[PDB]
């Protein structure tokens, strides 16, 4: 729950070892992506992976 | 204080004609010092033998007396290749020049 993999956990190439999110500033988006987001109703997150 | 149409006009006029910015708020009344600065920033538009006159080239220039006194003149003698005279060149500059360093 803290974001770190448990000791003795099998991991594969390209796996999330430590989940860290950083605050991302507001950036302009293409109109097609905005239309798709409005169609699906999901809200764009303000944090970056 | 107030910010009517006449308040901005008189403020701009008093800032343009010239006056201390600190007294600008007091003359207008009510407005403080910080308000007028913000308004102007937001709105924009923010004995010898020669006197001191008969001193020619190649002459002594060692002063004698007090310049703020009645009689103040210079020597005015044969003192070419030097500002001061030979009689004062040894008393003005550092006598017995002995200095050296590395280079």
């Amino acid at each position: 729950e803290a974001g770190i993999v448990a000791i003795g956990a099998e991991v594969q190439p390209g796996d999330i070892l430590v989940g860290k999110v950083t605050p991302k500033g507001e950036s302009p988006m293409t109109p097609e992506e905005k239309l798709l987001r409005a169609i699906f109703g999901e809200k764009a997150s303000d944090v970056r992976d | 204080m107030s910010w009517t149409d006449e308040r901005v006009s008189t403020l701009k006029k008093l800032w343009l004609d010239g006056l201390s910015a600190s007294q600008i708020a007091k003359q207008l009344g009510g407005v403080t010092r910080n308000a007028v600065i913000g308004k102007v920033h937001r709105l924009g538009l923010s004995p010898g033998s020669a006197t001191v006159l008969t001193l020619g080239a190649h002459m002594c220039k060692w002063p004698i007396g007090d310049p703020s006194s009645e009689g103040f003149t210079f020597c005015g003698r044969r003192s070419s290749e030097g500002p001061y005279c030979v009689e004062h060149a040894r008393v003005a500059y550092q006598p017995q020049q002995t200095k050296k360093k590395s280079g």
């Binding site: 109109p31 097609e32 992506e33 239309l35 798709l36 987001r37 169609i39 699906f40 999901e42 | -």
Partner: protein
């Protein structure tokens, strides 16, 4: 806030390796650059958006392309599109909602769902 000032930034020519070669300028990534795989995904999305906008009526498609700048460089607000359209302010939202509901069907928005994921 006084601490963490980042004074005296490291020179980009400092040799990272023990030898003279392999400077610090090589071990640096460019963040502003966009990868070609990302740009290729944008073309696919721009083309699929035109194909999906073929079953709707001309009025709803026109109002959607006017409010959302799909083929237009400048965006248009609700009042701006209403001044040019018959419906002044109110029914434009209803037309947009109807067009959005028409696109929410899985049969019509099956290929378009993979972009969001």
């Amino acid at each position: 806030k006084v601490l963490k000032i980042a004074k005296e930034p490291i020179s980009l020519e400092t040799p990272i390796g023990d030898e003279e070669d392999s400077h610090l300028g090589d071990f640096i990534e460019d963040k502003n650059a966009i990868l070609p795989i990302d740009a290729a995904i944008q073309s696919n999305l721009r083309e699929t958006t035109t194909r999906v906008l073929a079953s709707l009526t001309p009025r709803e498609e026109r109002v959607l392309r006017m409010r959302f700048g799909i083929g237009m460089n400048t965006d248009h607000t609700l009042e701006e599109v209403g001044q040019q359209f018959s419906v002044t302010r109110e029914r434009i939202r209803q037309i947009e909602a109807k067009a959005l509901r028409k696109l929410k069907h899985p049969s019509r928005s099956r290929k378009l769902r993979s972009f969001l994921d």
